[PDB]
Design a protein around this nucleic acid. Structure first.
Ligand SMILES: [Mg+2]
Lengths: 178, 165
RNA sequence: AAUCAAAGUUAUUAUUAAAUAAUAUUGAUUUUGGAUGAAUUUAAUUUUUAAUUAUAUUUUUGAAUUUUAAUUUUAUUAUUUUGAUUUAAUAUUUUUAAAAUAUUAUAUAUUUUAGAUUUAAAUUUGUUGUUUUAUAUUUAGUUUAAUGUUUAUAAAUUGAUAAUUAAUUUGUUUUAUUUUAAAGUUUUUAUGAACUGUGAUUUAUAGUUUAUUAUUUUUAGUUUAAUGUUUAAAUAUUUAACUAGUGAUGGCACAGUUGUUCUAUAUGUACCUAUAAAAAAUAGUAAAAUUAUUUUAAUUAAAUUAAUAAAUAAUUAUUAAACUAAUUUUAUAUUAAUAUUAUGAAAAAUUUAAAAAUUAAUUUUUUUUUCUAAUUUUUAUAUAUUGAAGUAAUAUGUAUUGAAUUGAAUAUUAAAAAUACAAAUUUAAUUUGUAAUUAAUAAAUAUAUUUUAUUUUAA
RNA sequence: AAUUAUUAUUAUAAAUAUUAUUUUAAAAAUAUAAAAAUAUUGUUAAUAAAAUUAUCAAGUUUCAAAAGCGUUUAUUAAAUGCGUCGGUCUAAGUAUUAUAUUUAAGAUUAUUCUUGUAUAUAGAUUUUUAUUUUAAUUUUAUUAGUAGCAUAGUAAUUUAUUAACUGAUUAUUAAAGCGUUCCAUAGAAAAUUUUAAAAUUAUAACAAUCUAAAUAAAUAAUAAAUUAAAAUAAAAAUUUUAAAAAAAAAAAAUUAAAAUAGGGCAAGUCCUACUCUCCUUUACAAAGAGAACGUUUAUAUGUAAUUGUAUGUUUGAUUGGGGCAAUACUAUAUCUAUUUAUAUAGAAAAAGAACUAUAUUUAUUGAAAUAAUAAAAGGUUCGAGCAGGUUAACAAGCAUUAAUACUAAAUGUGUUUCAUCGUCUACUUAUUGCUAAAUUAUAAUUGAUUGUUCAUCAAAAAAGCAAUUCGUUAGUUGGGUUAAAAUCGUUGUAAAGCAGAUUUGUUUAUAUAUUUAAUUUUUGUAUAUAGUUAAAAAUUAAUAU
């Protein structure tokens, strides 16, 4: 055995993920192929609205048009003004003026034949938003259901572990991982 | 069937074109003893101020000066090693030739140009092929020995018959 | 059903160890002989219980080495009368012995689920995590001096005599060390003949076939087989075979370069490589190890040689260096001095070789502070419209040749003609009969673009 | 004997003691076998020496090969042993004797010829063959001969068997048996014939003893696991990983179900052997002592001598310094030649010079398996190679790695292969493996397979034959020669004591035929003659909430 530094990988050899792919050459290893990429790929674009402008609404890579052609619904309410700095001051109807509007559209949605037992349910949740802002989203629910427990462990010092001096709080705070 | 030894490296021990001391082996040639028989013809025959060692066919310069290879005009396979003794004579021109051609004021038809030598000779001596191709009759190659005693020909050289140009 | 992460204190008792110290010493653990001695004998000109201040010589060329230090002068073999002093070490036993958090159709501990996975060390001679070690807890577990302050001074040379205009340091004399564990061995003497050899040792406790005192044989301990396989056994249970010993399990006798051997290199106390004892043999030349996180300058090399790798280049390393034209106002790891148990380079580009890889080749050859930002995406285009099948007697001619025969369609021969139809099917030959050099445009991309794994910041 | 264990410690003596340690409600294996129809070797490498029995426990016969009856650590043409014979010995033992050997008794015979040891020898070596030792290469006559006989082989013939790799016979040039040969030959190991109880194939067939639980509490092994399955690709390897994609008790398929054997290589040591290396060496010879004997020398060097060498590289040849082959060179492919052999002692004494070594050049012979070994890794049986089968497709001497031999038994499996549609043969010889060939008619081909079972083969000084060796020994052939642990994980078969009920979908050890008859249509077709079916035969049924 010729044990010389610079004769191979300096101390032994390790297979970190930046190696098992992108090996010497970028192909890169013969074994340890790699993990399949199980991320969340973004979804493809919706179709644009029909043209009926004759302004060449069809052209994609033109200077005038921003790519997105989203003339959706109460967008005319989002009437924007030109500031001084070059910014924009978009005046939109508040989150209540919309849910209160949505109730109107929805309450006259199912009433034609018979508002279903779920249709009565939605207008309640809608009429529950204007009044109380009864929130329905995970990002707060995932936060609130936890943040409460985390802060109550503080007010009532239910630690059981008072030492935890950032060496023992070293593993923790990184054995968790967000 | 047998074994074999490794072929040694017989290559230049200076940089051609650059100055040279005498204790430097200019080139360590293959005394091409085909296989240790006694007849060889070295690649780089000796030139001006260069003297060949008899045993190992290595050219050692005889006076310190810039060195160069003169490829024979007839056959570009047979080269000499010229050492021209004056190092300032070429340095103080190179520093010009390379300062002129920087300002774009030097001509590329120079004799020292590598790719021009084929045409350079032909601008001056237009029939030099015929001056070396000409076969001499055995009469003129041994000019009348009486012309040597009568003193007409300064000295008869009967063996120097080959035009090495 | 399934998980669930989990208890650091016994309690109680007091004069050894190790080195050291330069005063004693006829063999430590009952009362010899107990007839009267013959029986209680360890001594000799050799590195020895005697332990020696140099680097020059000289030397099988290579493990060989320096002579009184003061003549009896103190370097000399050592304890009770400070728990004898000192410094290092520190216990050992008795009986102690403990505990309440994460699912509900399953990848692996974080409470908010999902994301997440070499267990390490070696070994990788990149045959690139190459089939090796580790159950766990604690204890024990490996020796190259990182330093030069006043008395004080060094420094070369011939082969040899000698010569030394030859140019010059440093040093109150610096030495000592050199890994760790591990063989088979190997030599030096002590123990063993209760096992077992062989020497020697017993002169008639059952059955039986045959004329026979010889001879077939009852034959429960032994040439086989099953079981057993850390077994009840480091050889036993059951069983086959054998069994006739006036010539032999046996008084004591031979002992290790050797005894014994009806000889198998067998055994001589449960592996004969005898035991026992005393060494530091060798083991770097692919054995196992070699103990201290948070760092602060990089790299490979591939040649001379080898009764085939401790040695050399080259590399790497430790320490140290000086700014020679070439350019930008760019950009540059070049060296010295020492330390060095190494022979073979992925994917290519090619080149030897039945290679069926080896060989040459020559560029690779990964150590993530934390929050964040980002331009390389297990999503690309695949060959058909048309079984053109009606439309007409002939005529050099069934050419010639070869042929049993051949008439365009046996065989060979193929540029003859004229009023167009000789590379076939068909028939033993012909005629009939199929056939009559035609519409059938895939080309016109389809999405191009956008949008995704590494080009930054802030702390 | 590690114990309160297998265990009458057999020196003796005796013969009627109602002397006193053994859990328990089951079927699997297994140790084991009472009982019981046929069959008799078709099982197997091979049946037959294979426990006891009141049903009283015994196979007979022929041929070939084979001695003594003792004796042995892998148990026998091992080694003993009597006789004969060769040699030695008349101042320690009886010369028809005892030493020292080679053979083997009994019966026939015991051939041809010599190059060396030994003897004799004459200063010694060198020479030198009455007998002896060893030899005979075409000794090879007698004699047996395919035989434990180097291949060639299953020898060619004959038998024998349905089938003859058996075995026996004839002869007979046997790779190189051979006079210590050959015959004769008994219990042995074969080959027949034949009979036969072991549960030999067929064939499966629990009577017996060997619970759970309660109690006591050991062992191998142990990096971890929540992954482990399963399928597929891989890349260095057997696959294991990686990845993708899925989704209690028995058995031994995997993990190391194994131990430990089997290799071959490296450095180290061991042990044995002989013409070539070398001491301590006790013998031979010389000399010296008026030789009274013991010592010391000199010259000699003995395998009796126990030291060390016996290589290295590519595989068996090569070792040098050059050159051509892209100013690459494994030895690649070719060739050349005063291309030179450094040092040290000797040799040359002025400046000049000789000798020799794997020609970088350190050591003082060459060989062995010794059951070789110890510390290591690494292969014979392979994700790739090589040489000898009809020429060519195929057995298979080098790149991995406790996978730890071929075959058989049992037991599976995924493939693939024409028209339904397809794959169950059993035997003989040899256990080599695969064919030959007998049963009317005769087994598809690949692949992964065997720690469960044997051991037949292959196999480790126990021998022996021919064969190579100066020997130690080496390689064919035959007889011998332990083959093994409490099952933890996976895995799978079952089970969880439950149930008034099979079943929606998962998923399937489970599937009608491949030892051929008789019908019936034998007419259609043409020289013989088909085709659905049926009966019989191969005799058995299968449901987790
Ligand atoms: Mg410790």
């Amino acid at each position: 055995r010729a044990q010389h530094p610079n004769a191979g990988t300096r101390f032994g050899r390790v297979y970190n993920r930046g190696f098992v792919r992108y090996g010497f050459g970028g192909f890169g290893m013969s074994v340890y192929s790699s993990k399949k990429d199980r991320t969340f790929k973004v979804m493809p674009v919706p179709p644009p609205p029909p043209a009926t402008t004759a302004v060449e609404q069809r052209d994609d890579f033109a200077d005038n048009r921003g790519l997105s052609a989203t003339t959706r619904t109460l967008s005319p309410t989002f009437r924007m003004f030109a500031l001084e700095d070059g910014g924009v001051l978009v005046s939109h109807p508040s989150h209540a003026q919309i849910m209160r509007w949505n109730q109107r559209v929805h309450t006259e949605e199912g009433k034609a034949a018979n508002s279903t037992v779920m249709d009565e349910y939605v207008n309640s949740r809608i009429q529950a938003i204007i009044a109380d802002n009864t929130i329905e989203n995970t990002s707060l629910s995932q936060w609130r259901k936890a943040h409460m427990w985390n802060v109550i462990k503080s007010h009532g010092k239910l630690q059981r572990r008072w030492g935890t001096p950032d060496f023992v709080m070293g593993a923790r705070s990184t054995l968790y991982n967000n | 069937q047998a074994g074999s030894p490794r072929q040694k490296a017989k290559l230049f021990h200076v940089i051609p074109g650059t100055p040279v001391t005498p204790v430097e082996k200019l080139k360590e040639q293959r005394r091409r003893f085909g296989q240790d028989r006694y007849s060889r013809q070295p690649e780089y025959r000796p030139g001006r101020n260069v003297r060949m060692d008899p045993n190992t066919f290595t050219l050692y310069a005889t006076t310190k000066g810039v060195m160069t290879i003169r490829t024979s005009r007839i056959n570009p396979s047979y080269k000499w090693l010229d050492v021209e003794p004056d190092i300032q004579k070429v340095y103080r021109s190179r520093c010009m030739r390379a300062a002129l051609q920087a300002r774009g004021k030097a001509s590329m038809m120079v004799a020292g140009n590598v790719h021009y030598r084929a045409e350079l000779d032909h601008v001056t001596e237009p029939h030099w092929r015929e001056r070396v191709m000409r076969v001499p009759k055995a009469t003129e190659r041994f000019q009348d020995p009486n012309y040597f005693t009568r003193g007409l020909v300064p000295s008869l050289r009967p063996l120097s018959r080959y035009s090495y140009e």
